[PDB]
Write a protein that binds this ligand. Structure first.
Ligand code: NA
Ligand code: NA
Ligand code: NA
Ligand code: NA
Lengths: 16, 16, 16, 16
């Protein structure tokens, strides 16, 4: 929205 | 550590 | 653009 | 390996 955020997580289990 | 996690954030302000 | 692509590279040297 | 590279791509089709 620049402001940005992303994430990714795996254990097998993700967002401008 | 597979289990994995990463993130990135920007507003301008990031982690197996 | 949904279709999304992001990348991050560090050696210390990142794109809906 | 620190040097780090990650990428994520979605169209719906991801690498220290
Ligand atoms: Na948006
Ligand atoms: Na480790
Ligand atoms: Na866009
Ligand atoms: Na390694």
């Amino acid at each position: 929205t620049a402001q940005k955020l992303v994430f990714f997580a795996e254990d097998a289990x993700k967002x401008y």
